[PDB]
Amino acid sequence: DRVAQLTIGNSTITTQEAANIIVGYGEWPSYCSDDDATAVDKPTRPDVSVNRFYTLDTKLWEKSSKGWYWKFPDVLTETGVFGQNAQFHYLYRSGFCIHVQCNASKFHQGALLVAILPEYVIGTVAGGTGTEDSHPPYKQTQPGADGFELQHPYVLDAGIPISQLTVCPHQWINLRTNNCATIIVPYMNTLPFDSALNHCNFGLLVVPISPLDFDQGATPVIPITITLAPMCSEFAGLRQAVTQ
Amino acid sequence: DRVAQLTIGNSTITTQEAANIIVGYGEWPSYCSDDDATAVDKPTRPDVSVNRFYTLDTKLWEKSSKGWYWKFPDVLTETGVFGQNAQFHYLYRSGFCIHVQCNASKFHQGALLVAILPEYVIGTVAGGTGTEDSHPPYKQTQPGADGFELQHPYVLDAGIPISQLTVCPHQWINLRTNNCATIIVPYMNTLPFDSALNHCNFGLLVVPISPLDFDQGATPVIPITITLAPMCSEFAGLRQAVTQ
Amino acid sequence: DRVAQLTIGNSTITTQEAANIIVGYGEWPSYCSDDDATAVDKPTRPDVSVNRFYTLDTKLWEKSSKGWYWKFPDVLTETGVFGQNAQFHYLYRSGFCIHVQCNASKFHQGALLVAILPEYVIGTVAGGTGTEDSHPPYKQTQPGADGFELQHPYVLDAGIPISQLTVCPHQWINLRTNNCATIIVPYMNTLPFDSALNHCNFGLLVVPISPLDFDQGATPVIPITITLAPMCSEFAGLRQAVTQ
Amino acid sequence: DRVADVIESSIGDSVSRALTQALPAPTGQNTQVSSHRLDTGEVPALQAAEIGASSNTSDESMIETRCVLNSHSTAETTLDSFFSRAGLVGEIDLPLEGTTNPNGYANWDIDITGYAQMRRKVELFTYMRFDAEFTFVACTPTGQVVPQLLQYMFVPPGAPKPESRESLAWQTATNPSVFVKLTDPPAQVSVPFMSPASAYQWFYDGYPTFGEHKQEKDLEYGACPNNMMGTFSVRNVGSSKSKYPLVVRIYMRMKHVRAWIPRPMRNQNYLFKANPNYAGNSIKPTGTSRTAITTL
Amino acid sequence: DRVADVIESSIGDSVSRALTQALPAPTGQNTQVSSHRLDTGEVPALQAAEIGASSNTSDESMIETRCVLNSHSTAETTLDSFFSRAGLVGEIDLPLEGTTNPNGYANWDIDITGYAQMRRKVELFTYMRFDAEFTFVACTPTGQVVPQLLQYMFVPPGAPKPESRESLAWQTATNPSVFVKLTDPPAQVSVPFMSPASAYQWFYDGYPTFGEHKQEKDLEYGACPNNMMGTFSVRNVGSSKSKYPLVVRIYMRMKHVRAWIPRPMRNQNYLFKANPNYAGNSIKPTGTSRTAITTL
Amino acid sequence: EIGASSNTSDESMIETRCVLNSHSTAETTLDSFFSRAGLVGEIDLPLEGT
Amino acid sequence: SIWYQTNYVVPIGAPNTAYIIALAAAQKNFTMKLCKDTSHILQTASIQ
Amino acid sequence: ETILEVNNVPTNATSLMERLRFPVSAQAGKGELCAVFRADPGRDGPWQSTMLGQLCGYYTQWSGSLEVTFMFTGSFMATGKMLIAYTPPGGPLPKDR
Numbered sequence A, B, C: 001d002r003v004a005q006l007t008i009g010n011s012t013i014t015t016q017e018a019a020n021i022i023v024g025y026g027e028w029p030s031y032c033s034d035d036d037a038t039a040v041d042k043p044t045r046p047d048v049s050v051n052r053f054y055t056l057d058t059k060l061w062e063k064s065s066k067g068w069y070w071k072f073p074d075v076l077t078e079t080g081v082f083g084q085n086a087q088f089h090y091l092y093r094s095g096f097c098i099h100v101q102c103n104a105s106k107f108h109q110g111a112l113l114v115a116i117l118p119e120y121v122i123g124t125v126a127g128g129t130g131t132e133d134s135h136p137p138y139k140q141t142q143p144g145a146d147g148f149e150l151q152h153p154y155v156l157d158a159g160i161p162i163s164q165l166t167v168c169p170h171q172w173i174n175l176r177t178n179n180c181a182t183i184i185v186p187y188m189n190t191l192p193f194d195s196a197l198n199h200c201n202f203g204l205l206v207v208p209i210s211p212l213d214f215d216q217g218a219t220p221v222i223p224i225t226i227t228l229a230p231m232c233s234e235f236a237g238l239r240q241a242v243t244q
Numbered sequence D, E: 001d002r003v004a005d006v007i008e009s010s011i012g013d014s015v016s017r018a019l020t021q022a023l024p025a026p027t028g029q030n031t032q033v034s035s036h037r038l039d040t041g042e043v044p045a046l047q048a049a050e051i052g053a054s055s056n057t058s059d060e061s062m063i064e065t066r067c068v069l070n071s072h073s074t075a076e077t078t079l080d081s082f083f084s085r086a087g088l089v090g091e092i093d094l095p096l097e098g099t100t101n102p103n104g105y106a107n108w109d110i111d112i113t114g115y116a117q118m119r120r121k122v123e124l125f126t127y128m129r130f131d132a133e134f135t136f137v138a139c140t141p142t143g144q145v146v147p148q149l150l151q152y153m154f155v156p157p158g159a160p161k162p163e164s165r166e167s168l169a170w171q172t173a174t175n176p177s178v179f180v181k182l183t184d185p186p187a188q189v190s191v192p193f194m195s196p197a198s199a200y201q202w203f204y205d206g207y208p209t210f211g212e213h214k215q216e217k218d219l220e221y222g223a224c225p226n227n228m229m230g231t232f233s234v235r236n237v238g239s240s241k242s243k244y245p246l247v248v249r250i251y252m253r254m255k256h257v258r259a260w261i262p263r264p265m266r267n268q269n270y271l272f273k274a275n276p277n278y279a280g281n282s283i284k285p286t287g288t289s290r291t292a293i294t295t296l
Numbered sequence F: 001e002i003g004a005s006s007n008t009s010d011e012s013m014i015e016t017r018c019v020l021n022s023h024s025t026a027e028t029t030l031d032s033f034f035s036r037a038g039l040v041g042e043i044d045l046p047l048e049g050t
Numbered sequence G: 001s002i003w004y005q006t007n008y009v010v011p012i013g014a015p016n017t018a019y020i021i022a023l024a025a026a027q028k029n030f031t032m033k034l035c036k037d038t039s040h041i042l043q044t045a046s047i048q
Numbered sequence H: 001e002t003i004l005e006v007n008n009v010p011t012n013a014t015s016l017m018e019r020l021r022f023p024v025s026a027q028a029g030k031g032e033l034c035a036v037f038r039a040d041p042g043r044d045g046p047w048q049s050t051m052l053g054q055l056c057g058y059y060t061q062w063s064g065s066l067e068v069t070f071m072f073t074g075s076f077m078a079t080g081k082m083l084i085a086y087t088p089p090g091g092p093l094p095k096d097r
């Protein structure tokens, strides 16, 4: 139960210090029913070429880090064959298998909260005073694969408490216990299909709740890598490639 | 029998002056058997997103035209989702439905020979004298979607007689009879899969055997358009996108 | 299906470039039921003497024509035995078989919209400004067999769009395709019988949607002839002949 | 005849594999007798929060319990019990003199996000599907009931919004309208679920249109048209100025409620309607604070 | 349970739908009696070459024919009858003095494309699979048979090619070798189909490697490694110079032949081995010409 | 020219999937369309005027 | 968007310009819901 | 089917009847653009001339496939091939064929 292997497509992930697997809302990704669908054109289900593990950028965990987030359909729109299909097709649909990995040693300590927040809408500080109706820039609402850093993690940059973020599919990475978190997310939206460009079904939040710490001499560079794989990907409404 | 419709993917072709359909070597495109295959990885069969009609550039038929040719896996390697898969995957396999269209009027005349020549290797004039071992440039062996014009059609730029080119799946476009040619080609190669970049399974030749002619006053611009659709496309050996 | 013959009474129409036959609202003309009737006197059903093809005036299609219209019970009230019965009897009832014919050559072009508009009430331009409550004269509301020309075809001289006139039993005469239009109309009114003099059940509209055109040298006179035959004619309420 | 990986393929399975099942729970769970347990191998108290699952430890395994037949109902915590309570969601002013709807008519953009109480509750969930019951309480600014006839009209998106008290749009040949006197009891009406989506979204993490998303258009981020149900218009049924100043309060009661995906409850004060902006200089803690962690 | 377009899907069909079938034809077709036919509607003589199919008109429908029981065999036109005839494909010189293999050994790159007769025949087809029988005829340049012992060695690609008459590679611990005297009848041996492909390609329209294809490397266009079977090495079995000048002619006879996709037959003179280059200034017609089209 | 609308269906123009359409056609019946009260008359009974 | 696949070809004696008429409608799976008033009201002043 | 005013350009008093049809003619052979229009039924534009577009105006929402039939009214001797394309949402107006 502490060891596990995730194989999908032509990619395999290994781990010897896992903490089980979470299946968001107790549901596995699935394809769209014939009665839940509307688009009449036959969709493309590329399978193995898009349903595989993509490893996005690595972040560095510092004793003062606040946390980061990634919007999901988004992080992959410019990567591999998944990205190509997401650009050529109007409609997209899929679940995800998210595997956040971060290892240290038996002498390091700290705890990361890895959670999935559906429809993660970002807010602004409203000019500090709260009298200015400002809005988050495109660079912040859809940060891409590089993710974005939280400025006010306590309120998740959206006026909501992070202490309650656990009502969402989550898992923790407690260095003294495990070195990775695995969460499987089904397609969640009020529509059977939607644009992979304009809409971000959910956001991945990785936030240090218990600060990283260690004594001088132990390796100081502790990376946090994000690996994710689409599941049951379906695309429809073919046309030319659109970036945004 | 003179009228026809070809629907595949999200594209439909219409014609009211056709001359039946030719099925190269009496075989329809099909997927690779489990006993004819070697690559052990599960292939991608994108279906509708790649098996559809792509319309390449248009050529102008002049009273002095010599003819043109297109190498096939090639013409599509930089177009649509077919091109993306052909670039991301090492191995490719597929048949094609080629539809060459060219219309005129009941007062114009001329005949085009539309043929498919497998393994169409191009030769050079050898410096004219035949003492120089020169070779055709990349721009000529794999002309892309713009096709390439024949310099010596009588010998097909390869030292072989065009008068015998009819032993290959072909069809004619005789302006007084039909305004299009349809040829369906199965995957032909000595291997179950091959690179869509390094190898060109066959070449499409469109050559005027009977010169175009008409009296001054009749529209002088007579285009020849090439539309083609992959069939039973399969890709394997995924990696990063490679252009060549 | 391109050829047809319409025989009724002692008249026969021939055509070798037809486009099927339209049966207005999917109903054939029929006689009045014993439960739909009110007038107690036994009606006259002259049959062959009135249910035959009457050929009204011919119009000339010019490169600048706007279109014409004919009110129907009306066009025939002063012709043949049908007219006599329509004048001697108070009540009239009948369907019609309308055959508009217009031929050209394989070098002429243009398209006429031939439609049937029930209760075709004519309006006026209201003195241009729209402040004058003027009304169309008798010569325009009931033009007789000579028909009347449209002044503002776009609005059918009644403030309604001609682009939607196709929701009515119609047919087109596209010179490159057919040279006639045949429409069969059942008796339509909110009463089982009505006066053939005061009321016009419907109007026949012949309007050029695609202008007539040809090169100088081709015959310039292109006529449009209207032939029509009553069907299941019934008359009642006999008295002296009344013209209006 | 057909490739094996295609036969044994599972691409196409439209049924969602659910790991959990909804069981009957009309009352709180009972407690069963428990005795001492002195053994190795079994440790109910020890958990691993890293897994992401809440502790499954029960009272019985932590202390010696008695038997309690719990018959406390769980009915008042259903979604309908929680949301089926009318609350203020709109307020329209029709003054005699001023700069706010002084021409005897008003157009209220249908949005229940203008009031904190009602808004915070619904924002506990991401998606919600429901029918509703709207009640319109009208009177003057002093609460005085006046003999005045009003006309409320629902203008779905695309329909012509009235530009004046005598607008032609007040003919309501197709839009639903309600004519009431302020002396009659508040008008009440039933509304169905009219979104083109399968549910309303209190949160839409995306943009409504394609193209470049420049600074000037960031106004559209988080704006979902599937939630924009149209306008609510009011007017004095007349052609002259009303003799009294009016106010119309709109209350909404949800019925037949379905809800999905719960979220953290609003932590900071609300500032605007179309977004979750908060005052960055006044970020207050979720709750109360104290001097020391070792003292109450 | 599963989406319908996936159930009714046909992606995966590995069986090739063939519109034609191979029928027995041990002899030429017979002719049947035919009589006059004066009728409308049926026109055997009229065809439409545009369709791309050869005329299906038969003798019987064009003229009044008798009955002929044709018993002419079609056996001599099978692929084996056509190709199973030994022909020259290689020629190796081992002179005493010169600049061409003067050290008593030679390495012939196995390629049957060096001689026109044999080459033109095989190039009638695009792909070919077959076993072969190689015969080596050796003697001096005058045709004189000399008492000399030679060693032929097949060096598959990857094996060490001999660099001299006394090379260590002549130990043939694994490579197949043949030791013969010129006084013995020509050595003959059987070779299997040793390509990693399912057939040899006389034409390969592509490049063997990826990357940029610059002017300098156009040398590789049309070069297929699946046809490069290795080297054939010869030497005087000794450590001193031979007393006579030698020549080795290599003949090849194909057996168990399969062939696919016919092509137009070579029209112009051959110039090189690895390609179809032709002399652009000497492009001759496929055949003979005449003065006028109306005179023989 | 025939005067009839195109009978071509989605299925014959592109490769379609299966969609079980359960969208009601009830709101487009004549009663749904016309059974909505609308202004058709307006009568004035002033104190002074013409 | 309509594009020329090849070209509009014609002999001598025939017009160099022709017209196309587009007719539009809905399919059998077309449905509408939620009645409202059309965006336009064909009236300016009282109708007399 | 009712006439779709794709050529909704002429507003002149005498030129209203020509919005009902658009031109096609001999070109230069480079896949030239002929006409363009949004497929949106209840939106201001060409569809406003159709019965469908008019009935839509009375409903807030719609669903379903649409169809557009193009009738060529040239002469019998005129030939040609056109490519009518439909670009789903997100796809900007295609720059070329």
Ligand SMILES: CCCCCCCCCCCCC/C=C\[C@H](O)[C@H](N)CO
Pocket: D110, D111, D112, D113, D134, D152, D153, D154, D176, D177, D178, D189, D191, D200, D201, D202, D227, D228, D229, D232, D274
């Ligand atoms: C006289 C008739 C009046 C009829 C009024 C009908 C009102 C129907 C209101 C439906 C309101 C749905 C509100 C749902 C979501 C919010 O608008 C969005 N979250 C705002 O962003």
Ligand SMILES: CCCCCCCCCCCCC/C=C\[C@H](O)[C@H](N)CO
Pocket: E110, E111, E112, E113, E134, E152, E153, E154, E176, E177, E178, E189, E191, E200, E201, E202, E227, E228, E229, E232, E274
């Ligand atoms: C003493 C043992 C000698 C054994 C010699 C074995 C020779 C086997 C030769 C196989 C030759 C296959 C030739 C086939 C294709 C040509 O090489 C290519 N078309 C050249 O481009």
Ligand SMILES: [Cl-]
Pocket: H040, H041, H042, H043
């Ligand atoms: Cl629309």
Ligand code: NA
Pocket: A030, A031, A032, A033, D014, D015, D016
């Ligand atoms: Na599903």
Ligand code: NA
Pocket: D054, D055, D056, D057, D058
């Ligand atoms: Na618990």
Ligand code: NA
Pocket: D027, D028, D029, D030, D069, D070, D071, D072
């Ligand atoms: Na209980």
Ligand code: NA
Pocket: D162, D163, D164, D166, D167, D168
């Ligand atoms: Na107004």
Ligand code: NA
Pocket: B030, B031, B032, B033, E014, E015, E016
């Ligand atoms: Na096969």
Ligand code: NA
Pocket: E054, E055, E056, E057, E058
């Ligand atoms: Na024959």
Ligand code: NA
Pocket: E027, E028, E029, E030, E069, E070, E071, E072
């Ligand atoms: Na025989």
Ligand code: NA
Pocket: E162, E163, E164, E166, E167, E168
């Ligand atoms: Na050596």
Ligand code: NA
Pocket: F005, F006, F007, F008, F009, G026, G027, G028, H067
């Ligand atoms: Na239809």
Ligand code: NA
Pocket: F020, F021, F022, F023
């Ligand atoms: Na249905």
